[PDB]
Design an enzyme around this catalytic site. Structure first.
Site, short mmCIF file in Angstrom:
data_model
loop_
_atom_site.label_atom_id
_atom_site.label_comp_id
_atom_site.label_asym_id
_atom_site.label_seq_id
_atom_site.Cartn_x
_atom_site.Cartn_y
_atom_site.Cartn_z
N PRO A 1 0.80 -1.22 0.00
CA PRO A 1 0.00 0.00 0.00
C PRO A 1 0.84 1.28 0.00
O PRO A 1 1.73 1.46 0.83
CB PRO A 1 -0.89 -0.17 1.23
N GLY A 2 0.55 2.13 -0.98
CA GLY A 2 1.24 3.40 -1.14
C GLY A 2 0.36 4.36 -1.91
O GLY A 2 -0.63 3.95 -2.52
N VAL A 3 0.72 5.65 -1.90
CA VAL A 3 -0.07 6.65 -2.62
C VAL A 3 0.68 7.21 -3.82
O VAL A 3 0.10 7.91 -4.66
CB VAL A 3 -0.47 7.82 -1.72
N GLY A 4 1.96 6.91 -3.90
CA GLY A 4 2.76 7.39 -5.01
C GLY A 4 3.89 6.43 -5.33
O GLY A 4 4.40 5.72 -4.46
N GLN B 1 11.76 3.74 -9.04
CA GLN B 1 11.53 2.90 -7.88
C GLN B 1 11.33 1.41 -8.17
O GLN B 1 11.19 0.61 -7.25
CB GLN B 1 10.36 3.45 -7.06
N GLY C 1 7.40 9.87 4.04
CA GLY C 1 8.10 8.60 3.99
C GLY C 1 8.23 8.18 2.54
O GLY C 1 7.58 8.73 1.65
N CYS C 2 9.09 7.20 2.28
CA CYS C 2 9.28 6.71 0.94
C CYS C 2 9.46 5.21 1.02
O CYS C 2 10.19 4.71 1.88
CB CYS C 2 10.52 7.34 0.33
N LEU C 3 8.81 4.47 0.13
CA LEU C 3 8.96 3.03 0.17
C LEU C 3 10.39 2.60 -0.14
O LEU C 3 10.76 1.44 0.08
CB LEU C 3 7.97 2.38 -0.80
N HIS D 1 6.79 14.89 -4.10
CA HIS D 1 7.61 13.76 -3.70
C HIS D 1 7.97 12.88 -4.88
O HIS D 1 9.14 12.59 -5.13
CB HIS D 1 6.88 12.91 -2.68
N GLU D 2 6.95 12.43 -5.61
CA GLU D 2 7.16 11.57 -6.76
C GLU D 2 7.98 12.17 -7.90
O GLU D 2 8.85 11.49 -8.45
CB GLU D 2 5.80 11.09 -7.27
N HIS E 1 11.65 12.24 -7.39
CA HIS E 1 12.22 10.94 -7.71
C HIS E 1 12.76 10.94 -9.14
O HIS E 1 13.83 10.38 -9.41
CB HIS E 1 11.16 9.84 -7.58
ZN LIG Z 1 9.33 7.86 -2.41
#
Ligand SMILES: [Zn+2]
Ligand SMILES: [Zn+2]
Lengths: 192, 191
Positions: free
Chosen positions: B45-48, B53, B109-111, B152-153, B156
């Site tokens: 589960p994540g939003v971005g 990645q 946070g970042c996965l 955020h994305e 990246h």
């Molecule tokens: Zn991230």
């Protein structure tokens, strides 16, 4: 009961640590704290530890880097890093100052942020004044890896962690520690 | 099958990602990469999620905020973060730019960096031009949380992580997340 290392987030880690009154340093209380720091430093093999790292808001740091510790370490690495063993050291109310403008870039870690590493710039040689275990006034001159430990630990006393002084885009997982440095990243090593 | 998320350290994560030739976006190849991104994003589960990645050096990002994702968070928080749900959004060759000077401070946070968080400053409202899944030219305006995810994305796509953009000494373990900000730190939320 032996304390546990506190981690990033706990304020005592990000807030300035106050001095120990010289004369209390010979106390069973402070002596206890110091023996704790040493026990913790050794118990999860690291070479440096600062009071705040065990919830103690005092200006105290301990460090040791042994022949054994180094026994397992790429001879080339040991070279470039200029890592030499040195007897267990304790310093209360330490005051660090660089002895010159030569610096070096290598990867640092902290027991307060595990699972990760990041390249950070440190002075190659430094001097540190303060008191030892028995509260005896001292002055220490170091260079190489030991000089780095001193800086890392002392930083802790002013509430600073490597992550806030690290080289952009070098931060990484322990498992990725030895992965190509991304284009644009300064290269590990020292001026002299 | 499905690719794994690359953890901080892997070079692809810290190097500028190249644009995808519009007209190829409709490609079976790129369509596959986007579907992978969506599947992975939803899996953990994540939003971005950004292409790099998953090891894909291309300028592509996917994001979506669910009321279910919003569900496991206090409303007192969801309000302050101006966090609203929004449809799955895919953007190739996105180009972000702020719509104003208003900013906000909250923990990110970042996965690619798990077990930790840190407060980061972001623009409250932004605009983003680029193309959607079918290669259609678009323009997106957002604010609040969705504006943050977009920042955020996109970052990246330039090889930038929050850790190199965080507020000094706010960086913490997901566990100590609810602990106090240190003396000298700004406050969270908007101005
Ligand atoms: Zn991230
Ligand atoms: Zn440390």
């Amino acid at each position: 009961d032996l304390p546990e290392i506190v981690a990033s987030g706990d304020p005592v880690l990000h807030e300035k640590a106050r001095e120990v009154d010289p004369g209390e340093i010979g106390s069973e209380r402070i002596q206890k704290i110091i023996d704790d720091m040493i026990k913790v430093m050794r118990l999860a093999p690291g070479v440096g530890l600062a009071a705040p790292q065990i919830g103690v808001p005092l200006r105290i740091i301990v460090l040791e880097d042994t022949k054994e510790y180094i026994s397992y370490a790429p001879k080339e690495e040991i070279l470039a890093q200029e890592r030499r063993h040195f007897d267990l050291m304790v310093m209360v109310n330490p005051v660090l100052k660089e002895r010159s403008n030569k610096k070096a870039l290598f990867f640092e870690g902290c027991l307060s942020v595990d699972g990760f590493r990041a390249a950070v710039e440190r002075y190659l040689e430094v001097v540190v004044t303060g008191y030892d275990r028995q509260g005896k006034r001292i002055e220490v001159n170091a260079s190489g890896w030991q000089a780095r430990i001193l800086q890392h630990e002392c930083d802790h006393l002013d509430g600073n962690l490597y992550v806030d002084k690290m080289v952009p885009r070098t931060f990484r997982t322990v498992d990725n520690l030895d992965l190509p440095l991304a284009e644009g990243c300064p290269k590990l090593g020292s001026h002299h």
